[PDB]
Ligand binder design. Structure first.
Ligand SMILES: CCCCCC[C@H]1C(=O)O[C@H](C)[C@H](NC(=O)c2cccc(NC=O)c2O)C(=O)O[C@@H](C)[C@@H]1OC(=O)C(C)C
Ligand SMILES: CCCCCC[C@H]1C(=O)O[C@H](C)[C@H](NC(=O)c2cccc(NC=O)c2O)C(=O)O[C@@H](C)[C@@H]1OC(=O)C(C)C
Lengths: 54, 423, 105, 57, 446, 54, 53, 49, 146, 54
């Protein structure tokens, strides 16, 4: 049996960006959701390194 | 002292329709449209159509949507029912005096303006399964259904419930076709309680005028005979043994009716030995443990099935059946006393009297009479007809059951249930 | 029938061609927003319509992904645009409204 | 005395809007609950009997 | 056009007469050729005690088994040959024995009743035979989940009181009751001032009175010294009984609240609200479109197989609630919905639904009173409970009085923030905890 | 697009001092914004319905 | 297009929950008052004057 | 046989207004609920402070 | 059963035997639905031990030796305690079973009692069957000689 | 239908401390899971108010 589907944790990850069905159809205007995510972490990440000195 | 007991008014319209009413003066009204549309009119290519039909009494009509029928009728606390037998369907509607206008309309819409929308009938098919499951929970339902399929080659052999293979398979056109070729004037009758003849007659002349179906006994039951056995591990063995008898309406049908009360047909005292029941007593002699028996009598427009129905422990099935049979044989041989027939006649008479005591049972009698005989026969004269049965008639009846080709259905652990040729 | 009725028809034919779904092979009704009423009417379509609607929308979603369109001679010609879903949608709305109306008394 | 159903015996299904689906023709059974051991289910994959649309105050 | 109001006026008055026994003799004449006569006794099992429980039931089994002047067969043979129907029943408060018969057979009909009610033989050999039949009836009853759960509701709601007992008794009593136990319950309870000869059909009241005085004279020619058959009120208990059994395919639940009892005028209004919620069954045509919100939701989401509201009455108390049947994973939803409805009514009954409820109830009433038997039973029983016969018209007036406000006020009085008596049986693992069910008997919004 | 450009307008004005042209034009852009989202787009929608025969 | 909720029943539903909605504002006012020690409103209440002589 | 099922005696846990099998519990209905609700009302008044 | 009953012949022939015989040969080669889940371990044990006995068994082998078989047989296949006779003897009855179904075609078999395997009359029947026809000998042919 | 069960958010909350089946059996030694939770938030909460001054 595929552990990628029954493990309490992976489920979430499978549902997030692996098996989740998406429109064959979306275009570049749908990228800004990842970009906002990326933005959020990178912001959190540099932001933190500044806090070790600020 | 109650009021003036009105007389029932009966009327045959030229187009064949029958209208009958009784001004009740009762607080509630009851109206039925009875139709020559039962399962006997189905055929080998459309079985179950009248079952599904029986269950579509609230799908949308032209003058009233599903939602409206339901809400409308319950808003006045009325009911809409449909009853089927092998010969008729009967749409019955009930409510208080002041509300017949609303119910009548609903009634006319269903019976003469059903739309049988493709999707509404898809959503209904599954009921056929539920409905049947609930019915088939009594062993008698299955027995009697098999009994009719073994007894008749064709019409009356049809089932009152949809064959599983048709579930989900009966189509909107089959429903439309069925209504329009059986729900016509010449095969209908409109009965009412708490209603007036003029109102009925107006409704009838304004809304119940259609023709284009068929008109005859669309086939005519061919009695065949034969037997159907279904092994199952029910705890007890149910079985019915029967032979062709007489069509409703003939004098011979009353001989049979009297025969049934001589042999026994249901108990009259709570938890009694069935002292005066001659079948019961005859089995009891030779048989220990639990069992039941009664004469079975079923008559139709052009045929009838008569005999008995026994329920017994698997091992005593044969013993129960044979004693039962021999009993009947004993009355065909001549062994019947006048005081015996006299007591039966009493049960029958008192019985009929009682059966049309309430309004739902009177509506039904008037309605079935209308369709079977195109007339109304008062109690005094049914009683008079029952008295006309001579002892010899009852004996010949028995002679006719005994010497006639038989039909048998039984279900249970059949290890000791005999086949017909072993009787 | 007017000279100006052809004008309104002309403004409509104009919008249609502008709206553009026809280049993707869609039909007007293939582009309705799906809501409860619309979902129920989609449910009531007979097999062939439903199947055809599915194929259409698949063909568009497909085009839309390649960002292409159909050859001009295969676009949905206004006036050959069948309003296949209106009657059901209209009936579904009627019955809802009857309910809505019953709920007031 | 027509009315096949009520002349007892043949089967007769009733369906309804507000009331309950019935199968109530005639054969034995009441004389079987007396000499006992006729179980019967208690609402197995089923419905409900005696039914409602009758009452009082 | 003869109106409904007017129709109620046409129903003939029930004539009441008292003998010197204290035996009330009542009738409702009609044009019918048949009829229904019988005696209604103010005797049940709420009148019994821990040790003679099942006595009434044991008597019923003997009532038709033979009298002094008519031993064994005799009775049956008289009834059966005259084509009549002999029947009887008993609840926790009442006992009845009635005869359906050709109306021209009123004289012997009554004679037979008397004998049955007075000279019940109780031959010892019969008592023994009957002992084993009733035992069997119990094995049988054990399979009707419905019969079971209602006995459990009664058992828990009225715990510690006679009303908590069942009509048939526990097996040991049936195994232990003796002829002496029986006859003493008979003489204790079958006394004129607690009996009512009732009848409906083609009779004339005078003829009934004559008979009653001819065959019933001499029952309370002895008014008892200090035997004071008085019913002590019965405590109600917010409690819960769960008979888990995952071997059953469907679960039965019965929830109730304490009712007022036979005589309280609150019944009418409660019955209206009950009608609003109504009942359901999986063979009802018309699912999604039902007026009852509970029923419609149950049908669309397959919440059950069947449900039904009810209002049981006994003297000064009663169970008021609903009983349902469903799959093991729906017990929670059914309960939620059932309860949310009860609250909606307590706090938000709208006007029209109440009209529907009133109409339903009118329909019910009139429809129920159809035919000799149902009427006769209403006469006899009502005389016992209301002391009189409440003419249709009066009920119609009581119903008309009711409107939304009355429903909210009356519902709140009995349901709002009240302690339920819950009874469970079947695959009940998902049946909510009593606290949870209790919490569902009030709304935090209100 | 009129909305986008108009937002690009507000951005530009916001970036300028509260003086001559800049005041009245940024005052118009504001009204536009609210009138566009609150009246114009909702009406454009209804007209399109009507044009399509919906 | 909130016309779906315009009718006799809604009018009755609305009226039924009038006492509740009222008492529920009484709870919130007093609640806001007590929580912020509303100088204005409180001065009026007989006792509760922890700011007098 | 299910009629052998009596509910076990609880006198051992019952509030005193409820010990009598002959006394309607509706009389102490108000008093009993009142008390427990007063208990939580006070409680919550306490958390409030 | 579902897999078997997918051929209309399976059901026909099963009905054929139930109509033809009162008792033994009328039994079905597949379990009646009502027994599904209902046959118990003791019924299995009882069935093996009263039918899987020496006097009703036979051991056949290919690529094996008689001595080996015989040794195995004498060492392991020696049990008795079942029954021994035709445990009933088929009673030919006759009759008919019809099952309406909406298959596309109507399958039907008509039959009468004939001869037990082993008798000379059974070969007459066997020859009769090849005179009338019993399956085709040429791929897609008119069944000329049938 | 009970929104407390089908709403994407409540589900979680229903599963956390409303409908979740627990042993009729646990004792005080099982409280420290809530206490640790409480600890964690209260710590986060006072900790934050100190950070507005630290
Ligand atoms: C740690 C990295 C593992 C990823 C798990 C968390 C991230 C996550 O959930 O991943 C998937 C990728 C999520 N959806 C998409 O990207 C996405 C969805 C439809 C279409 C596209 N693209 C083009 O059509 C997409 O890109 C998405 O992009 O959401 C992020 C905001 C979220 O990030 C967050 O939550 C933050 C709170 C962590
Ligand atoms: C914000 C408050 C809403 C609660 C949702 C979050 C909190 C939460 O999930 O709640 C339930 C209450 C969770 N389990 C229990 O308490 C619990 C479980 C079995 C038994 C007991 N007690 C006695 O037998 C319990 O108390 C528990 O207590 O976990 C906390 C650590 C978690 O807290 C956390 O996640 C933090 C990360 C927030």
């Amino acid at each position: 049996t595929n552990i990628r589907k029954s493990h309490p944790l992976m489920k979430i990850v499978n549902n997030a960006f692996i098996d989740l069905p998406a429109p064959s159809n979306i275009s570049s205007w749908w990228n800004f959701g990842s970009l906002l995510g990326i933005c959020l972490i990178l912001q959190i990440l540099t932001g933190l390194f500044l806090a070790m000195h600020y | 002292v109650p009021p003036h007991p009105q007389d029932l008014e009966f009327t045959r319209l030229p187009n064949g329709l029958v209208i009958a009413s009784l001004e009740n003066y009762a607080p509630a009204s009851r109206i039925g449209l009875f139709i020559k549309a039962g399962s006997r009119y189905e055929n080998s290519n459309n079985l179950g159509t009248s079952h599904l039909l029986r269950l579509a009494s609230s799908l949308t009509t032209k003058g009233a949507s599903s939602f409206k029928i339901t809400r409308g009728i319950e808003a006045v606390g009325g009911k809409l029912s449909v009853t089927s037998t092998r010969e008729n369907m009967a749409y019955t509607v009930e409510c208080l005096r002041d509300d017949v206008d609303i119910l009548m309309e609903f009634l006319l819409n269903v019976t003469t303006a059903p739309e049988f929308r493709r999707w509404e009938v898809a959503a209904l098919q599954p009921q056929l399964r539920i409905d049947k499951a609930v019915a088939l929970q009594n062993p008698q339902a299955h027995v009697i259904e098999n009994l009719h399929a073994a007894a008749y080659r064709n019409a009356l052999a049809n089932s009152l419930y949809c064959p599983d293979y048709r579930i989900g398979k009966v189509t909107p056109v089959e429903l439309h076709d069925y209504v329009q070729n059986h729900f016509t004037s010449a095969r209908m009758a409109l009965i009412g309680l708490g209603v007036s003849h003029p109102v009925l007659k107006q409704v009838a002349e304004q809304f119940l005028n259609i023709r284009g179906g068929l008109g005859l006994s669309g086939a005519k039951a061919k009695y065949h005979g034969g037997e159907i056995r279904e092994q199952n591990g029910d705890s007890l063995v149910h079985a019915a043994l029967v032979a062709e008898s007489a069509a409703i309406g003939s004098a011979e049908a009353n001989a049979f009716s009297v025969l049934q009360h001589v042999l026994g047909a249901g108990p009259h005292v709570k938890r009694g030995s069935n002292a005066t029941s001659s079948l019961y007593q005859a089995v009891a002699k030779g048989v220990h443990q639990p069992f039941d028996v009664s004469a079975f009598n079923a008559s139709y427009s052009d045929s009838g099935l008569f005999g008995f129905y026994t329920i017994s422990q698997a091992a005593s099935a044969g013993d129960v059946i044979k004693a039962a049979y021999n009993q009947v044989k004993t009355i065909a041989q001549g062994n019947l006393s006048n005081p015996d027939v006299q007591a039966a006649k009493n049960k029958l008479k008192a019985g009929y009297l009682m059966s049309v005591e309430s309004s739902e049972g009177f509506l039904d009698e008037v309605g079935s009479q209308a369709l079977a005989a195109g007339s109304y026969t008062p109690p005094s004269t049914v009683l008079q007809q029952i008295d006309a049965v001579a002892d010899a008639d009852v004996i010949n009846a028995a002679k006719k059951f005994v010497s006639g080709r038989k039909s048998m259905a039984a279900s249970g652990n059949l290890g000791h249930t005999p086949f017909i040729d072993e009787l | 029938v007017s000279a100006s009725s052809r004008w309104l028809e002309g403004i409509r034919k104009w919008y249609y061609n502008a709206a553009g779904f026809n280049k993707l092979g869609l039909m007007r009704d293939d582009t309705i927003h799906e809501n409860d009423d619309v979902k129920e009417a989609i449910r009531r379509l007979p097999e062939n319509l439903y199947d055809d609607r599915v194929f259409r929308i698949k063909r568009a979603l497909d085009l839309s992904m390649r960002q292409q369109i159909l050859p001009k001679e295969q676009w949905t010609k206004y006036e050959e645009d069948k309003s296949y879903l209106e009657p059901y949608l209209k009936e579904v709305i009627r019955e809802r409204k009857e309910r809505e109306e019953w709920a007031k008394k | 005395m027509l009315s096949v159903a009520a002349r007892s015996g043949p089967f007769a299904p009733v369906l309804s809007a507000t009331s309950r689906g019935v199968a109530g023709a005639l054969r034995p059974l009441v004389q079987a609950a007396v000499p006992a051991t006729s179980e019967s289910p208690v609402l197995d994959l089923k419905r409900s009997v005696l039914c409602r649309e009758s009452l009082r105050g | 056009t003869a109106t409904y109001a007017q129709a109620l006026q046409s129903v003939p008055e029930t004539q009441v007469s008292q003998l010197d026994n204290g035996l009330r003799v009542a009738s409702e004449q009609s044009s019918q050729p048949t009829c229904t006569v019988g005696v209604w006794i103010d005797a049940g099992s709420r009148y019994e005690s821990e040790k003679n429980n099942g006595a009434g039931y044991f008597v019923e089994h003997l009532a038709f088994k033979g009298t002094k002047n008519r031993p064994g067969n005799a009775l049956e043979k008289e009834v059966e040959s005259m084509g009549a129907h002999l029947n009887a029943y008993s609840t926790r408060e009442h006992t009845a024995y009635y005869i359906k018969a050709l109306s021209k057979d009123l004289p012997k009909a009554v004679e037979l009743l008397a004998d049955i009610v007075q000279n019940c033989s109780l031959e010892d050999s019969q008592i023994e035979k009957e002992r084993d039949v009733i035992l069997q009836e119990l094995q049988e009853n054990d399979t009707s989940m419905r019969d079971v759960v209602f006995n459990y509701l009664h058992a828990t709601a009225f715990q510690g009181t006679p009303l908590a007992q069942s009509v048939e008794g526990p097996s040991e009593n049936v195994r232990k009751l003796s002829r002496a136990d029986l006859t003493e319950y008979l003489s204790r309870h079958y006394k004129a001032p607690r009996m009512v000869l009732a009848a409906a059909g083609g009779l004339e009241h005078r003829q009934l009175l004559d008979l009653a005085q001819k065959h019933f004279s001499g029952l309370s020619g002895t008014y008892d010294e200090d035997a004071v058959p008085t019913l002590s009120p019965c405590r109600f208990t917010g409690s819960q009984i769960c008979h888990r059994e995952d071997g059953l395919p469907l679960a039965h639940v019965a929830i109730a609240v304490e009712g007022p009892g036979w005589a309280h005028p609150d019944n009418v209004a409660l019955q209206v609200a009950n009608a609003i919620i109504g009942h359901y069954d999986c063979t009802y045509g018309g699912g999604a479109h039902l007026s009852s919100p509970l029923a419609s939701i149950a049908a669309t989401n397959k919440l059950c197989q069947s449900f039904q509201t009810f209002n049981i009455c006994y003297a000064d108390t009663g169970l008021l609630g609903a009983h349902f049947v469903c799959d093991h994973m729906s017990i929670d939803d059914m309960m939620f919905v059932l309860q949310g409805q009860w609250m909606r009514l307590c706090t938000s009954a709208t006007e029209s639904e109440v009209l529907r409820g009133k109409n339903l109830l009118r329909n019910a009433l009139v429809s129920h009173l159809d035919g000799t038997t149902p009427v006769c039973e209403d006469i006899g029983r009502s005389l016992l409970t209301y002391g009189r016969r409440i003419p249709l018209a009066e009920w119609e007036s009581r119903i008309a009085e009711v409107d939304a406000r009355v429903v909210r006020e009356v519902c709140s009085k009995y349901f709002y923030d009240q302690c339920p008596a819950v009874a469970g049986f079947g695959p009940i693992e998902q049946l909510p905890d009593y606290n949870r069910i209790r919490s569902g008997m009030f709304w935090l919004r209100f | 697009w009129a909305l986008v450009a108009d937002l690009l307008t507000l951005t530009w004005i916001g970036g300028q001092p509260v003086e001559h042209p800049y005041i009245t034009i940024g005052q118009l852009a504001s009204v536009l914004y609210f009138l566009l989202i609150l009246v114009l787009m909702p009406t454009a929608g209804t007209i399109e319905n009507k044009l399509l025969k919906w | 297009m909130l016309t779906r909720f315009l009718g006799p029943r809604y009018r009755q539903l609305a009226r039924n929950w009038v006492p509740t909605a009222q008492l529920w504002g009484a709870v919130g006012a007093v609640g806001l008052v007590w929580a912020t020690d509303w100088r204005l409103i409180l001065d009026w209440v007989p006792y509760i004057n922890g700011k007098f002589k | 046989s299910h009629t052998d099922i009596k509910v076990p005696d609880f006198s051992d846990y019952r509030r005193p207004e409820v010990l009598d099998s002959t006394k309607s519990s509706k009389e102490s209905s108000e008093a009993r609920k009142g008390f427990s609700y007063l208990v939580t009302a006070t409680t919550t008044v306490g958390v409030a402070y």
